[PDB]
């Protein structure tokens, strides 16, 4: 059903599009939530959706834009929340 996924990414991931290559693929599956660069050069994804789509989403964040490395993605499932009217990136 409808869950809330965390997912911290690791890599080359600020400065690549990748939080514009999450934004436009969790646009594409429905999925709401947000993509955030954090202070140590990881971003965080939390993304709302079904299941089934918040595992598309993740297979495309393990895969990452062409100037990305994504070297290791920490992701967990949790309750759905219903916090988000969009994808927004921060
Ligand atoms: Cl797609």
Do not use: C
């Amino acid at each position: 059903m409808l869950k809330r996924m965390y997912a911290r990414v690791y890599g080359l991931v600020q400065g690549v599009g990748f939080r514009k290559f999450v934004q436009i693929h969790a646009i594409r599956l429905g999925i709401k939530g947000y993509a955030k660069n954090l202070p140590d050069g990881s971003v965080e994804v939390v993304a709302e959706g079904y299941e089934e789509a918040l595992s598309k989403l993740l297979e495309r964040i393990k895969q990452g834009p062409p100037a990305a490395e994504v070297e290791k993605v920490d992701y967990s499932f949790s309750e759905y929340k219903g916090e988000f009217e969009d994808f927004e990136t921060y």
